[PDB]
From a paper:
Here, we identify archaeal proteins that are homologs of fusexins, a superfamily of fusogens that mediate eukaryotic gamete and somatic cell fusion, as well as virus entry. The crystal structures of HAP2/GCS1 from Chlamydomonas and Arabidopsis showed remarkable structural conservation without sequence similarity. This superfamily of fusion proteins was named fusexins: fusion proteins essential for sexual reproduction and exoplasmic merger of plasma membranes. The crystal structure of a trimeric archaeal fusexin (Fusexin1 or Fsx1) reveals an archetypical fusexin architecture with unique features such as a six-helix bundle and an additional globular domain. Ectopically expressed Fusexin1 can fuse mammalian cells, and this process involves the additional globular domain and a conserved fusion loop.
Fsx1E is a monomer in solution but crystallized as a homotrimer in the presence of 2.5 M NaCl, 0.2 M CaCl2. However, we could determine the structure of Fsx1E at 2.3 Å resolution by running MR with a combination of fragments from ab initio predictions generated by AlphaFold229. Each protomer consists of four domains, the first three of which match the approximate dimensions and relative arrangement of domains I–III of known fusexins in their post-fusion conformation; accordingly, fold and interface similarity searches identify HAP2 as the closest structural homolog of Fsx1E, followed by viral fusexins and C. elegans EFF-1. Fsx1 domains I and III are relatively sequence-conserved among archaeal homologs and closely resemble the corresponding domains of HAP2 (RMSD 2.1 Å over 218 Cα), including the invariant disulfide bond between domain III strands βC and βF23 (C3389–C4432). On the other hand, Fsx1 domain II shares the same topology as that of HAP2 but differs significantly in its secondary structure elements and their relative orientation, as well as disulfide bonds. In particular, Fsx1 domain II is characterized by a four-helix hairpin, whose N-terminal half interacts with the same region of the other two subunits to generate a six-helix bundle around the molecule’s three-fold axis. Notably, unlike previously characterized viral and eukaryotic fusexins, Fsx1 also contains a fourth globular domain conserved among archaeal homologs. In addition to being coaxially stacked with domain III as a result of a loop/loop interaction stabilized by the C5457–C6477 disulfide, domain IV contributes to the quaternary structure of the protein by interacting with domain II of the adjacent subunit to which domain III also binds. The Fsx1E monomer has a net charge of −67, and another feature stabilizing its homotrimeric assembly is a set of Ca2+ and Na+ ions that interacts with negatively charged residues at the interface between subunits.
Residue numbers in the entry:
A (entry chain A): 25 to 59, 73 to 508, 537 to 542
B (entry chain C): 26 to 60, 74 to 510, 537 to 541
C (entry chain B): 26 to 61, 73 to 509, 537 to 541
The structure:
């Protein structure tokens, strides 16, 4: 025994147990148990998952499409008001239908009869819900080997997989102590929203929160009601309202969020995403290292040793994607373990040249002898150059094993956001109260002066982003 | 077993040795032997989240408004000046906002002028962002002579207790940092603080969406449009004041619903963000703090560990109806029927089809003969068109270090409705002809009713009904 | 102490042993002894926490543009006007077609009517917006090896690009990162802000307020700008009025940099840290975690380890506090000197605050050399419902604990309430008897005092400048 253990209720903890602290950190460490009678324990496979949930609320009203509803023949103003309250869609969600009414001269039912202008719900596109902060779940598989072959396995987790936080592995016992953090980020759930409908795979879909907000503002804040007033006024026809105005926001709002908007939606098929059928986002990277206490009962005078294989990293290839200003690109490297032993290889970007910034952390992978792994790191690009929209540069990829390392340079290319569309014109009034006109140049980064208008002239739009110097109601006569 | 040296401290120049201890709800007792019944133990732990707020010019005050009208202005400039000086500044540009109209005046020809304005009535609240919280831990360490505690110390990274380092008898305890459990925190981005002496402790948690819509309305132009409509005769002043202008303001100061945020308590017993202390007392532990215990037990002083174990017995189980879009809960009450203190990790180990575990495990320290209750979040999703209620089961597991118990719990899932039974919908088929469908009794599907002729259209009739009408709406024009 | 074996590494095949060390601002030194001297010592010197941010664009985040009006006449038919609007006018709602209004007018030469169009045209792009993503947390920790009193080797460990990375050699020893222990400190809220890309801004982009951008986007694409076209068509506004006062207000507000009060990512003071847009790094003023290390020491067959732990003596030399304004945290600071002869590990904190004041910060531990001084800073929040005093005085206690000794002191703090009203402004309300009452805001800006009740036939009517009057029971131009 290294530290003596006592217990009145457990024979295991009174019988010469000793405690070993082990972190599942992608290392090659093997815990060799000696009673002779060689047994070894090792952590092989690890995974991080994020489990999400959703929340509805009265503030998050349903996404609905609307049609116009018109009827005439009401005898009195009160009749029209009652019909609106009873049979028209409740735009403001106050319990009564919303609508407008107009009186018209009636010889048969004098002095007036009344018309009503209303909406009516056609269909519900989705019930929205907030997306809550996720729980972080780990899994870590521990393996027992008598000799060459694995003879027993156990998977530990703070979630529902495996045997849980404490389990038996042969005659030893493994107990979770908590997780050490790696510094990796989680996806931002606040920019997206959940959309529930049986039309969607698994019954719901991830939407963009801004689109939903704009829909809600439009339908419930008065703009839809203003469309009813405009229809009543003759500014719009009923067909115009229905076809072009009233449902645009709803129909945009139920679209799935773009992959650029959130890591919770996969761009490519192989990329991970938030599975709406399981509420799980399987992070491509480890977010923490779980730490364990291993209680080993190896009898009287039983001891432990550690076997640590080491490998040799060899970079086989490198690649990079175009980095577009405003979105991070990627630098990738394929690394092979050319050594005879298992390796623990930490890949990272160690530098990037001017204009390029590393916006990622390192990643460590367990690599078997003769096997290969691929690394991927996020690189961001920014520039204020007015001369070149495309800029070439370099970043350094480094992979460190425990014993040896390898590094190489990787070319990267940055693409600026355009400042203007080539050929488009812009106008400006100077301190001398005179208008100036400029044209966007071919590189989409600068404007070049064209002309300054005279004192009595003004720079006036001509359509298709053109302006001209000139020294608006014919229907008003 | 490791020698410590120091020129400035006699404590660290003596025969001290360092022990690593994590406050993890275990039963471990650190037995101290001089060369004698002394034991050190961690008994009670708590996690708290401390919040703050941030104001900003962008977050304008929540105010209610009335209309302001006056006439008799002699010139257009007089009216403009009066508006700039005496009217509410809707757009926050330093000058009052308003509209003016000229009217024929014999006494002051050619015209006099009216003004249409708002005026502030009351300030309902000053809004503020809610910041990310600091996570505070407390952990109580006890020193026992025999079975009785002779000294206690509370360690914390906040204001409670003695802080991160304290003396406990002849020993010293030093915080090293916290190990993470993976549990989530509440989402502060959905909510805002609303400051007013009308509110308990001077502020309240509001819904951020409601405030955003209020701000959009008052400062984005819609209130100004109400002034234009009042000027035009579309509305009267009374209508504006009573039904239009203050609706968003009054909605925005309402407290956020419990469904919106964990920071507002559903039940009296449930925790929430106390506005009088800025503290949210999390119902579960968020991390395990790690400590170094420096023991000075003389020249030949050594340590042992005593580890009691218990026996989990599930006494009862419970579950709430799970409504699609909001997680429900499955609960279990567990008794320690053994003779020793226990460390019981509860979890859900599985759920049947349609149900997803969206929670992590919970570990509780349970005294002999005592009972604790666990609670885990379960989410439900379905695309069935045949059944609104779906039954299933989840498995609750409780693992002690030595033994375990498990049981199954029935759960019921309820879908969101896709439509209201009896409501109708209209659609144009592939043959460019209108079709009408009726929502079925189960509120999940629509069934075909009829197809309109080519010259006909599916036209709303009020109360969610449609009819085919020949196409061949302004009697007041 | 623990036997190691390896077929591929000579370092791990001998009699190396592993030491667990956390870079936690302590004074601990790992003293290495060969045989059973040759004293080598390892210590961690400098640590830092940084947050690395990135951005994300999206079709939903449309460009921030300024607009002008575009008018043209002479179109022969309604269809000509419709096509011209779709082809040559700015697409307000981003549906692929230009947006605009048209009006018919009597034409003698082209009967019966010709047509006018009312449109917007893009003038300039002010910025391309992007979301700001959650950051990665990067640590650096410097390890030093000293022979005698001289440092002979240094190594910097990190989970990012600095130093040698997660594993490095230090002399004959090896240091391996195991992960970080969390301190509980908060990170800035990225959801309140947005990135604004333009070569007009330092390093090509700027941190903006997300609410301002949201309002701009709602206005331009949600119909309000289109309503301005309708109003211009109606004669309610002129083209010059639209252009100069209405259409570009939200865009120009949206490109302003976020205020320091909105986000910690924008520095209040010049010396205060912020999200550097040229490097995407926010250097947090405090440590966010303690990195944990395994140190493999190969000290031969009889090599052993000892720890030397210096201790200091805290002495508070000064304190300070800022005015705490209800709704924003203020700060309490203390300057502490180590008046002892040895290096110290000093944990500063606020241990209490009086009524109305709440500590909303965690402790801070700093390594302080003998004779050196450090300053601590802690956030304190203030809230009150007092109707009598806008200013409330109180106190907080600053405590600094070394490993061996401690010091404490009281710091005066001042809380300022938000005003409930502006003095002199009036308010109106209907009582249980459905009759109007008028109240005036008092000099302290917290309460209203009753002034008068209007008669049954009267109403409390606005009169300008926040005043109300009772008037008997509004369109002369109709
Ligand atoms: Ca292995
Ligand atoms: Ca996985
Ligand atoms: Ca929820
Ligand atoms: Ca009639
Ligand atoms: Ca459907
Ligand atoms: Ca609007
Ligand atoms: Ca939209
Ligand atoms: Ca990143
Ligand atoms: Ca990463
Ligand atoms: Ca640029
Ligand atoms: Ca106990
Ligand atoms: Ca508590
Ligand atoms: Ca703040
Ligand atoms: Ca006059
Ligand atoms: Ca009030
Ligand atoms: Ca509203
Ligand atoms: Ca959860
Ligand atoms: Ca939980
Ligand atoms: Ca469903
Ligand atoms: Ca030092
Ligand atoms: Ca720094
Ligand atoms: Ca991104
Ligand atoms: Ca014509
Ligand atoms: Ca054209
Ligand atoms: Ca520019
Ligand atoms: Ca909005
Ligand atoms: Ca604005
Ligand atoms: Ca002192
Ligand atoms: Ca804080
Ligand atoms: Ca802090
Ligand atoms: Ca107050
Ligand atoms: Cl309805
Ligand atoms: Cl994301
Ligand atoms: Cl959210
Ligand atoms: Cl879908
Ligand atoms: Cl819509
Ligand atoms: Cl999107
Ligand atoms: Cl390796
Ligand atoms: Cl005012
Ligand atoms: Cl929440
Ligand atoms: Cl926020
Ligand atoms: Cl309240
Ligand atoms: Cl309002
Ligand atoms: Cl709410
Ligand atoms: Cl137990
Ligand atoms: Cl354009
Ligand atoms: Cl912040
Ligand atoms: Cl965001
Ligand atoms: Cl700038
Ligand atoms: Cl704008
Ligand atoms: Cl701001
Ligand atoms: Cl100290
Ligand atoms: Na928002
Ligand atoms: Na509108
Ligand atoms: Na994963
Ligand atoms: Na570097
Ligand atoms: Na022209
Ligand atoms: Na008056
Ligand atoms: Na205290
Ligand atoms: Na320590
Ligand atoms: Na309106
Ligand atoms: Na708690
Ligand atoms: Na399971
Ligand atoms: Na009809
Ligand atoms: Na408007
Ligand atoms: Na820092």
């Amino acid at each position: 025994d290294s530290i003596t253990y006592n217990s009145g209720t457990s024979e295991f903890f009174d019988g010469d147990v000793f405690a070993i602290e082990v972190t599942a950190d992608q290392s090659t460490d093997e815990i060799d148990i000696y009673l002779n009678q060689d047994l070894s324990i090792e952590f092989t496979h690890q995974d991080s998952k994020l489990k999400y949930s959703t929340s509805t609320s009265d503030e998050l009203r349903d996404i609905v499409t609307l049609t116009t509803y018109y009827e005439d023949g009401f005898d009195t103003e009160q009749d029209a008001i009652d019909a609106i309250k009873s049979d028209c869609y409740d735009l403001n969600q106050n319990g009564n239908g919303s609508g407008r009414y107009s009186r018209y001269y009636s010889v048969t039912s004098p002095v007036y009869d009344y018309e009503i202008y209303c909406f009516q719900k056609n269909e519900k596109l989705a019930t929205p819900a907030y997306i809550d902060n996720p729980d972080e779940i780990f899994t870590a598989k521990a393996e027992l080997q008598a000799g060459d072959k694995t003879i027993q396995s156990a998977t530990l987790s703070n979630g529902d997989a495996g045997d849980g936080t404490v389990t038996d592995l042969g005659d030893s016992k493994i107990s979770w102590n908590g997780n050490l953090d790696l510094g990796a980020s989680e996806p931002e759930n606040s920019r997206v929203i959940a959309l529930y409908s049986n039309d969607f795979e698994n019954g719901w879909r991830i939407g963009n929160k801004q689109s939903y907000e704009d829909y809600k503002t439009f339908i419930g804040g008065g703009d839809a009601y203003d469309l009813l007033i405009d229809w009543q006024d003759g500014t719009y026809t009923a067909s115009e309202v229905e076809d072009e105005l009233v449902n645009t926001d709803a129909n945009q709002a139920v679209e799935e969020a773009s992959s650029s908007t959130t890591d919770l939606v996969n761009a490519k098929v192989k990329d991970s995403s938030l599975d709406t059928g399981s509420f799980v986002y399987d992070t491509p990277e480890l977010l923490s290292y779980p730490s364990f206490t291993v209680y080993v009962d190896a009898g009287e005078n039983g001891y432990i040793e550690v076997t640590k294989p080491t490998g040799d990293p060899d970079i086989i290839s490198t690649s990079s994607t175009e980095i577009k200003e405003g979105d991070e690109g990627t630098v990738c490297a394929t690394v092979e373990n050319v050594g005879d032993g298992e390796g623990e290889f930490s890949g990272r970007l160690s530098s990037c040249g001017e204009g390029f910034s590393i916006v990622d952390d390192q990643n460590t992978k367990n690599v078997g002898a003769g096997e290969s792994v691929t690394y991927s790191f996020d690189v961001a690009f920014s520039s204020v150059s007015s001369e070149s929209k495309e800029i070439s540069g370099s970043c350094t990829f480094e992979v460190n094993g425990v014993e040896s390392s390898d590094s190489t340079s990787v070319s990267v290319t940055g693409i600026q956001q355009s400042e203007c569309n080539p050929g488009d014109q812009r106008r400006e009034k100077n301190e001398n109260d005179r208008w100036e006109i400029y044209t966007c140049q071919d590189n989409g980064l600068t404007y070049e002066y064209d002309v300054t208008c005279a004192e009595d002239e003004k720079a006036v739009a001509q359509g298709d982003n053109q302006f001209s110097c000139e020294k608006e109601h014919h229907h008003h006569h």
